[PDB]
Symmetry: C4
Subunit: 97 residues, 4 copies
């Protein structure tokens, strides 16, 4: 269908944004007076922390550019997780019979 397939594709897109966001956030933050967004294996963990919108506080950006990257990974999580709710909402609606 569409609903069932657009969602599955959005999760493939979310992984893209995480890896790209992690690796972009490092080069944005690394040379500044700021938190450990200075190694990749920590930026990956930050992405997941942020895209889920759990936001522990153990890591975050302090650069203007690094904070842009943030917004992107934030909405990428919210939106793509919204699709998966939407997909299930029509699967449940697709039982009106």
């Amino acid at each position: 269908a569409l609903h069932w397939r657009a969602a599955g594709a959005a999760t493939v897109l979310l992984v893209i944004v995480l890896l790209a966001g992690s690796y972009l956030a490092v080069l944005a933050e690394r040379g500044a007076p700021g938190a450990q967004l200075i190694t990749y294996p920590r930026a990956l963990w930050w992405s997941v922390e942020t895209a889920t919108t759990v936001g522990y506080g153990d890591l975050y950006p302090v650069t203007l550019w690094g904070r842009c990257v943030a917004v992107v990974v934030m909405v990428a999580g919210i939106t793509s997780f919204g699709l998966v709710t939407a997909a299930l909402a029509t699967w449940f609606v697709g039982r009106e019979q």
Copy 2:
């Protein structure tokens, strides 16, 4: 349509609430014994942090008034991000054919 257009307009409304919230939160908090909601370029970052409901902890209000502003930017995020889920949910429902 409506669903597709009401959502796009809600995101234009969310930007309004962020800028207005940021600039209102500063004047509420600036003269108090509290966290760096004392400059604008930091209040903008707080808005995004809060409207996403990521809530890192690096910034927040300690004034009663500054904490009102918070609630507003909080629900503004939740609600308007809900509309975008709703918009996609009917776009997926709009394929019953």
Copy 3:
């Protein structure tokens, strides 16, 4: 209708849970070696922080009982905010004509 009215009633219910949760969390936490869930005007702010699931970190429970109260205010927020998304999702679906 129902969708439009059940939601409006759920938000009246959320306010109930906040005030009841705030005032229950204080008496649970006040006498323990733990964070400022020891005054009411701070427990109210914690409720909003938690029901939104923003979770700044400036406040939280450290008692087993105070942590139960938490769960309640957590899901009360998630669920009732879900209804408002659901309400809008059928209002958008209610334009199939």
Copy 4:
């Protein structure tokens, strides 16, 4: 039905993931230079903190393995709480009459 029953079953599944996640996160983290994911009664509280995506910051994983467990309990919360929104969205749609 399905929508009303699949959701109720997902919440039974969420409890499973919490207890399994809590008890798996402890053995992953206990022997490392990291935060109090070193006792069970604290890992249970972390699960709820994370599955709700409140993320206070008082607790989190610092191990690669402990951070995997995290992702699992994160999406488990997002997804299963999505179903409950979806369930209510079709219950409201199931009044088109």
